[PDB]
Curated annotation (Swiss-Prot):
Transmembrane segment boundaries: none
Reaction(s) catalysed (UniProt annotation): Hydrolysis of proteins with specificity similar to that of pepsin A, prefers hydrophobic residues at P1 and P1', but does not cleave 14-Ala-|-Leu-15 in the B chain of insulin or Z-Glu-Tyr. Clots milk
GO terms, molecular function: aspartic-type endopeptidase activity
Residues of the full protein shown: 90 to 419 of 419
Protein name: Endothiapepsin
Active site: 35, 199
Family: Belongs to the peptidase A1 family.
The keyword Magnesium is assigned to this record: no
Group of enzyme by EC: hydrolase
Location of the Peptidase A1 domain: 17-328
Entry's Gene Ontology BP terms: proteolysis
Keywords annotated in UniProt: Aspartyl protease, Disulfide bond, Hydrolase, Protease, Signal, Zymogen
Domain of life of the organism encoding this protein: Eukaryota
Amino acid sequence: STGSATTTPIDSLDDAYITPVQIGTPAQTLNLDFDTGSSDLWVFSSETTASEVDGQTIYTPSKSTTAKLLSGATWSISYGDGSSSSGDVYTDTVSVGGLTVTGQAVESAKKVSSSFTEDSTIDGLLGLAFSTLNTVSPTQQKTFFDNAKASLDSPVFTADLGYHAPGTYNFGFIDTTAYTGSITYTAVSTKQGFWEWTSTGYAVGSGTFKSTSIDGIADTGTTLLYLPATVVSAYWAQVSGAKSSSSVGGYVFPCSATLPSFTFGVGSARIVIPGDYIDFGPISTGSSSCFGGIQSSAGIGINIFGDVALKAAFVVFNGATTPTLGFASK
């Protein structure tokens, strides 16, 4: 089997992407944030505290003939941005782009933090990291991808995120028309439950490539590119007027400045992030200070190749017995 679904930016900055997902019988379609940095499929639901729901589409398990309470199961998750949610669990039929999993754990939110309530465009998350990070207790549950894997033509999914445009998540096959050149594969460590890999270095603009190992995670659920302070400083030093602002919470730059590209290494291959991808617009409406798309990972504890980086590539998440990551230009 295979599946193919279009993913669409939630706003003009590509802050996140939503992908339609069919849950239950008859289908209830919710727009979920596919997140390769976490491993829970959770939804706004008929059980979510009413004051915490503001415009989202909800899953109502009582209206699904295939929903079954996963008796005794609870879940509770906190994300790197300080957001959180928690609740109980149903199993139900879940389909993504024509690919169907029966008996998928659908984690129904009883509570969500303010960041989720305030984002009317995101109806939940669909985790695509390794199932060892799943928060369901007492019985940890498998991700959609893990459940689908055995039925897939090939045990892979791909992320092809657009810059200010829709893209595609495919399951079970690699679309050879979706990228240019070849796919370079690189080793993954699953020790922390993430798609964790080591970039071979970086370049700023037309500068010379610096060979240096940068361990990080491929995370579709993080907007920006978070790298060591040394790397980030080297980048912003090439932007006229750029500075790190403690009041704003990162590097900002005058909207009049031109941004250089940023290249990252995948083995001997190179992915070029165009300068425009690094512009996240005014810090506040009408401001001449623009927020940068490359920021320091210092104090996160891990480097994160988020959407800024991933959307510059066609990315293969290879879930074979020995998992790997592939990157191609496009």
